[PDB]
């Protein structure tokens, strides 16, 4: 019954907002990541790192504001406030992109904090820790896209900037340069995200339309008691319905609810792997057989060749402004362009 | 087009002509679909987390449920007690009907908007 | 020396067979294009 | 088309190996009960 056990007692008290030991890591980091994003998007430019405005103060709206990445010349500098680049000058720190690494790093440790919190609370309450396990998928996505992907490239500059339109540009970049839609690891991520959303909607709808009549009113919500032992909807009728509509149906509620964990968690894990490859420019860019034929046979056209033309347009038309440190000068005559447009 | 790359062609052409990424109804669609995936995982993890011990370690816990049993197979108060503390109490459902209706509504409405 | 007490029967129900076969065949359908390249 | 010639064996084994594994497990499950 020394200080450590006394502190444990206090951290674990049942209060409106549980703290825990995990709170020590979670709450500072979550607040700082959140605070950095709100501070940067309200007051901080991207003029010196990107040649872009990016804050409310500068005239941007909620869709175009961002905390942008540091200049490609920072490489992978940690860009610590007291580091060799900003040298403890807060203002320079902001202008050089220091708030990006601040948000990325504090965010990373907040995500750790949050997942430890799911572990801590589950242990105290006495439940299995599957919610923590499921959260491993968001973590994998965050580290692979925000940390691993730029670490494989020339600098943090090519990570996503924390902003709505800035993430849109990230999407389009991955199409034009990595041909990311062709990547089977992304396709497995797509099937997992859309698969989850489908499962979500189909499971909620099914339960709500196989409810038992347990009260008298037209609002069926009141007729549920969270301590009742009975299932509140008929699995038997649900199974018949789906067996006769779709051919197959769930028959085991445990499998069903595990499947709902499995599908989107796996999907996200898969796309993270694909992004890890893209860190190295290990793209699923082409099909060699298609290109050999197309080069030799100018009447051979597929949706595959049509989409690479599009990628080539994206690259040449956005590169000069999107990578200003490269000083790309593309005269009009070199820009790829169809007829008239 | 009715094909995999054809689909991507449609998407790139659509973005160029409609700036669909910058359209609110597409943004709601992403919210319907990201959130759908989120709540799928949440609900599956919370129910799986509060399965009542009915089996040994050498068997799938799935055999703790028999098709047509009347008793629920998980403890919804333990799930509420975990989730309400993970966030705070009133950000958690303890009414299964409201919860499952929520699950139905979020992605359905988001996908209506994106359509 | 006695036989090993730690041995256990192993099981795969029919539904898991159908689930796994679907998994493998769809995964093959997806990657085959990339193997042929 | 000038496709990679090992793609065929890659694909055939990719299907056959794990499928056979599942079938072995299923059939010996059925002869138990």
């Amino acid at each position: 019954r020394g200080w450590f056990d006394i502190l444990d007692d206090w951290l674990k008290r049942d209060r409106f907002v549980f703290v825990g030991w995990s709170g020590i890591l979670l709450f500072p980091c979550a607040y700082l990541a959140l605070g950095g994003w709100l501070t940067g998007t309200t007051f901080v430019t991207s003029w010196y790192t990107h040649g872009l405005a990016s804050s409310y103060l500068e005239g941007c709206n909620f869709l175009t504001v961002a905390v942008s990445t540091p200049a490609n010349s920072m490489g992978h500098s940690l860009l610590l406030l007291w580091g060799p680049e900003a040298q403890g000058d807060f203002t320079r720190w902001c202008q050089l992109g220091g708030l990006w690494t601040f948000i990325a790093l504090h965010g990373a440790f907040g995500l750790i904090g949050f997942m430890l919190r799911q572990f801590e609370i589950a242990r105290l309450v006495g439940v299995r820790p599957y919610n923590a396990i499921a959260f491993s998928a968001p973590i994998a996505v965050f580290v692979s896209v925000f940390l691993i992907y730029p670490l494989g490239q020339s600098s943090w500059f090519f990570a996503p900037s924390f902003g709505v339109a800035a993430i849109f540009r990230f999407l389009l970049f991955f199409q034009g340069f990595h041909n990311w839609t062709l990547n089977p690891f992304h396709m497995m991520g797509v099937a997992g995200v859309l698969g989850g959303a489908l499962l979500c909607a189909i499971h909620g709808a099914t339960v709500e339309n196989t409810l038992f009549q347990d009260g008298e009113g037209a609002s069926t919500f009141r007729a549920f008691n969270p301590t009742q032992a009975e299932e509140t909807y008929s699995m038997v009728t649900a199974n018949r319905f789906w067996s006769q509509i779709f051919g197959i149906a769930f028959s085991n509620k445990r499998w069903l609810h595990f499947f709902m964990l499995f599908v989107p968690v796996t999907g996200l894990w898969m796309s993270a792997i694909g992004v890890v490859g893209l860190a190295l420019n290990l793209r699923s860019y082409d099909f060699i057989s298609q290109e050999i034929r197309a080069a030799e046979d100018p009447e051979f056209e597929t949706f595959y060749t049509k989409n690479l033309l599009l990628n080539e347009g994206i690259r040449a038309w956005m590169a000069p402004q999107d990578q200003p440190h490269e000083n790309f000068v593309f005269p009009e005559e070199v820009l790829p362009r169809g007829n008239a447009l | 087009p009715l094909g995999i790359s054809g689909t991507f062609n449609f998407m790139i052409v659509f973005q160029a002509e409609h700036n669909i990424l910058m359209h609110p109804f597409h943004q709601l669609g992403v919210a319907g679909v990201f959130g759908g995936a989120l709540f799928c995982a949440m609900h599956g993890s919370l129910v799986t987390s509060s399965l009542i011990r009915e089996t040994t370690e050498t068997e799938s816990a799935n055999y703790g449920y028999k098709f047509g049993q009347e008793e629920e197979t998980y403890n919804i108060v333990a799930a509420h007690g975990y989730f309400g503390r993970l966030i705070f109490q009133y950000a958690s459902f303890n009414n299964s009907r409201s919860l499952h209706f929520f699950l139905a509504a979020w992605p359905v409405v988001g996908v209506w908007f994106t359509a | 020396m006695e036989p090993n007490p730690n041995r256990q029967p192993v099981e795969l129900n029919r539904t898991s067979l159908y689930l796994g076969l679907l998994l493998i065949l769809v995964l093959a359908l997806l990657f085959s294009s990339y193997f042929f390249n | 088309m000038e496709v990679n010639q090992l793609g065929l064996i890659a694909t055939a084994l990719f299907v056959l190996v794990p499928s056979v594994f599942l079938i072995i497990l299923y059939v010996q499950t059925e002869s138990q009960q």
Binding site: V236, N239, S243, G247, I248, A249, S251 | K66, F67, G68, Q69 | N13, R14, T15, Y18, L21, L22, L25, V26, A28, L29, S32, S33, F36 | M1, V3, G7, L8, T11, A12, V15
Partner: peptide, 30 residues
């Protein structure tokens, strides 16, 4: 050979559909 392979797999999936539906383990109550 790649066309045969693609169609072979697709056709195995349709046959599996047939068995999964008409030759499923029947759900029995309690």
């Amino acid at each position: 050979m790649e066309t045969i392979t693609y169609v072979f797999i697709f056709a195995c999936i349709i046959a599996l559909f047939f068995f999964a539906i008409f030759f499923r383990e029947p759900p029995r109550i309690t």
